Design a binder for this molecule. Structure first.
Ligand SMILES: [Cu+2]
Ligand SMILES: [Cu+2]
Ligand SMILES: [O]
Length: 469
């Protein structure tokens, strides 16, 4: 009898009908896990801190994160027995039309007699995150989302942060703009009417991934895309996009809202990290269901994405441990029903419908070909950034049509050749040989005004090379 992870809007539909305990239990557990001292390995602090070990851009991204959510849920169970971590369904109809379920964004919550602060909205750091640096965080820091900023590690950063946050004083309004930035990412244009370019399409496409390796991560998917016709999309890509939106990037040059979800430094101290990751693991389980890999996953030997030591299904996923003291491995969490005792409830995109081929279709007239972008060294850009691609055609008589080709989100950190691929399905096949390509970068611009000039100038010297197939 596996437990059932349900959508959070499901637990909310139960609250709206007077059945309160499901939501209340969950909140109670989160109040629980956030209150444990920092030395407790089940504390929210300890748990979120593990991620600042983790695996991105490699074939353990999905199973490392599967086990990660499972430990958060173990720790919640040490407080309220039998509780399940709900998923934020980011491709459901409510989110396309209204964005984030309000239980994740509400200021307060009715628990026992008491109106308490919502523990799903933010976390207050019990101790500081420092070394002895703009990404560092003082005790008492409260996590923040778009449109606010949380860069507070230097006098300069904190002052610029205050000047930034004082433009957005009303929580009700901040929440509206957040919901509005989330729906725009999802749609891929001005806000359901989804387009081929948004996060919705990227999620739909990753379920078509041909093997686990190119599904698992953006390193493998990018090399596969350099070397196979068509476009494959790793689950990691849309996962990164949700990080940037909550974490401070608009869809519609510098992103000055520096929220915790926007960078790998403290993404894990925001509780929404786990609602989102709980839904990424669900996409992963859905992709296993739909391709028949509920018990067997394969890793292509020597493939890019399979190295840090080769990375294989026996590779430990530190720091997670079985009660033996043995580390978990990817072998230990392929089948979530058999090996971990849980399953997902109903949610968006679990069925392979014909509607979800019409979206990804090359419209009649338009090109089946693909644009590859190279010669980008990201090693010197700091923080996360978005590559937006475009084609402009100059006509027979001086008329320019502009063609938006899509986006690529690089989720990164504050402290390496990058290859992007874009379909040309937005443009009519004729015009492609007659097209001048380019990429706009949206980026953190040093984060503080004292590094803006250096970061903007490294961006302006980028030398991207173009290639149609
Ligand atoms: Cu991560
Ligand atoms: Cu993540
Ligand atoms: O992540």
């Amino acid at each position: 009898a596996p437990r059932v992870r349900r959508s959070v809007r499901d637990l909310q539909k139960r609250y709206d009908n007077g059945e309160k305990k499901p939501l209340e239990d969950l909140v109670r557990a989160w109040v629980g896990i956030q209150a444990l001292p920092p030395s407790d390995p089940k504390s929210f602090f300890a748990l979120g801190g593990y991620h600042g070990y983790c695996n991105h851009g490699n074939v353990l991204f999905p199973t490392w994160h599967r086990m990660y959510v499972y430990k958060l849920e173990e720790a919640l169970q040490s407080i309220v027995p039998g509780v399940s971590m709900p998923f934020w369904d980011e491709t459901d109809e409510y989110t396309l039309k209204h964005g984030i379920p309000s239980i994740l964004t509400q200021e307060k919550f009715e628990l026992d007699g008491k109106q308490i602060d919502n523990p799903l909205r933010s976390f207050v750091l019990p101790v500081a995150l420092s070394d002895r640096n703009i990404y560092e965080k003082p005790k008492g820091y409260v996590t923040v989302r778009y449109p606010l900023s949380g860069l507070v590690g230097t006098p300069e950063a904190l002052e610029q942060t205050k000047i930034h946050n004082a433009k957005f004083p009303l929580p009700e309004k901040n929440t509206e703009l957040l919901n509005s930035n989330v729906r725009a990412w999802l749609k891929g244009d001005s806000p359901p009417d989804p387009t081929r370019n948004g996060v919705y399409a990227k999620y739909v496409r990753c379920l078509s991934a041909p093997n686990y390796t190119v599904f698992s991560n953006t390193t493998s998917a990018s090399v596969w895309n350099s070397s196979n016709p068509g476009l494959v999309t790793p689950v990691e890509s849309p996962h990164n996009d949700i990080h940037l939106a909550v974490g401070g990037f608009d869809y519609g040059q510098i992103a000055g809202a520096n929220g915790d979800m926007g960078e790998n430094n403290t993404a894990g101290m925001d509780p929404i990290f786990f609602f989102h990751h709980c839904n990424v693991d669900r996409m992963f389980w859905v992709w296993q269901k739909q391709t028949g890999h509920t018990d067997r996953l394969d890793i292509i030997r020597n493939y890019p994405g399979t190295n840090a030591e080769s990375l294989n299904l026996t590779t430990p996923l530190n720091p997670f441990k079985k009660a033996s003291g043995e580390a978990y491995t990817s072998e230990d969490c392929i089948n979530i029903e058999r090996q971990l005792g849980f399953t997902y409830g109903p949610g968006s995109l679990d069925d392979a419908t014909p509607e979800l081929k019409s979206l990804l279709a090359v419209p009649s007239g338009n090109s089946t070909k693909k644009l590859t972008v190279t010669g980008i060294d990201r090693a010197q850009i700091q923080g996360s950034f978005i590559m937006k691609a475009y084609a402009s055609v100059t006509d027979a008589n001086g008329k320019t049509r502009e063609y938006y080709l899509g986006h690529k989100s690089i989720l990164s950190r504050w402290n390496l050749d990058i290859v992007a691929h874009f379909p040309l399905s937005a443009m009519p096949a004729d015009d492609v040989p007659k097209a001048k390509f380019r990429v706009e970068f949206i980026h953190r611009g040093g984060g503080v005004p004292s590094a803006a000039k250096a970061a903007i100038d490294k961006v302006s010297a980028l030398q991207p090379k173009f290639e149609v197939s």
